[PDB]
Amino acid sequence: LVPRGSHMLFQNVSIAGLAHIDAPHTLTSKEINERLQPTYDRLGIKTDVLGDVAGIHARRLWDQDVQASDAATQAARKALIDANIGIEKIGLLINTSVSRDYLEPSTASIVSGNLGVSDHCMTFDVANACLAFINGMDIAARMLERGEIDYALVVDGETANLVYEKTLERMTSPDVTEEEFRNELAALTLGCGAAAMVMARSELVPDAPRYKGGVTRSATEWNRLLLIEGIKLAQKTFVAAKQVLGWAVEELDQFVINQVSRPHTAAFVKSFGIDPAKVMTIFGEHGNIGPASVPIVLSKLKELGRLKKGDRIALLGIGSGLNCSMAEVVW
């Protein structure tokens, strides 16, 4: 009768399985710079924007022409093994990546066809920049909590090889200006990789990690500056999380944050007073893997044995929109 925050949390949703793929090919910003060196000179910038401003040593790329669906399929296979279940159990598959095979059909239907889902499995894509994986988890959770399905797959594969090729080669043309060159430059922090998660009704997977859900706030009036507005949005979203999830910063055990740049992380951790030891980071070697960053970090934590039963894990993203979501997992 009387609402309270805790009421809209999910009670019967768990994480049954989780996997990630690291893309194989390391590319350093050293190599990239040396390719860029003559156009650094030409325009006359002595600053190493990548290594020094952004703090990115290197990112990973695919070795072949891997399509988003290919990478998601691979991660999906691993996550079904992690969960110990066959594909015939899956009732929903959502694809959440920014990289997409086609305008249509959906990338989800391609991954579904690859894995061999049943004729009962519902499939669609969600797009929301870096927050989409959290969006897809929530959409699946609502079907699970209702009892419409028993298992769901949320997948995300990212490719940046073609982005680099076009952009690297603009940023060595004689006809490029500075406002041009500086804009294009952000393209070169992006990285490749993939992640997948199997979610389930908790009674099917007793004592699996629990997905409680979370909150979203937006500042779509905004669809130096991005950083400031991002932090302000995140502060407001943190209040909403206090109100629903009962969060205090000191009671949380990990912060799984979308992975952008050393300054952006720095600003985030200071502004909320977080112990940086509770914020695993991968941008400096993997670059920014977009919406796949969050589950990839969570999967790496699990695998390095860094999580334990009862840990409170905060998943959080600030994304173009602007949008900000925060959700809790209890390991």
Binding-site sequence positions for Mn(2+): 25, 63
- Out of 121, 130, 192, 324, the active site residue is 130
CA distances from 82 to 115, 197, 199, 304 (A): 15, 9, 12, 15
* SS3 label, residue 301: helix
User: Between 200 and 239, how does the x/- string for binding to Mn ion read (CB under 5 A)?
Assistant: ----------------------------------------
Nearest residue (CB) to ligand CER, 232 versus 302? 232
Region of 14-22, 35-43, 45-53, 140-148 interacting with a copy of itself (CB under 8 A): 140-148
What residues have CB less than 8 Å from 76, skipping those under 6 apart?
19, 93, 111, 115, 153, 155, 196
* 192 given a catalytic annotation: no
* SS3 label, residue 204: helix
Region of 60-68, 117-125, 170-178, 264-272 interacting with a copy of itself (CB under 8 A): 117-125
| CB distance 119 to 148 below 8 Å | no
Nearest residue by C-beta to ligand CER?
230
Longest dimension (CA), the chain: 69
Nearest residue (CB) to ligand CER, 91 versus 291? 291
Chain position carrying tokens 């590319």: 27
- Out of 34, 88, 104, 180, the active site residue is 104
Structure token digits, residue 75: 């991660």
User: Between 146 and 185, how does the x/- string for binding to a copy of itself read (CB under 8 A)?
Assistant: xxx-------------------------------------
Question: Of the candidates 120, 182, 270, 306, which one interacts with a copy of itself according to CB under 8 A?
Answer: 120
Q: Tell the smallest beta-carbon distance from residue 305 to a copy of itself (Å).
A: 34
List phi, psi (to 5°) of 264: -65, -45
Decide which of a copy of itself, Mn ion, ligand CER, none touches 8; Cβ closer than 5 to 8 Å per partner kind: a copy of itself
Q: Does 63 bind Mn ion (CB under 5 A)?
A: yes
* 121 given a catalytic annotation: no
Nearest residue by C-beta to Mn ion?
25
What residues have CB less than 8 Å from 306, skipping those under 6 apart?
254, 280
CA distances from 263 to 50, 186, 267, 322 (A): 12, 14, 6, 18
Q: How many CA atoms lie within 13 A of 41 on its CB side?
A: 8
* Distance (Å, whole) CA 199 – CA 265: 29
Nearest residue (CB) to Mn ion, 57 versus 242? 57
* Residues belonging to the active site: 104, 130
Footprint of a copy of itself (CB under 8 A): 8, 98, 100, 103-106, 108-110, 112-113, 116-117, 119-129, 131-132, 135, 139, 142-143, 146-148, 216-223, 236, 319-323
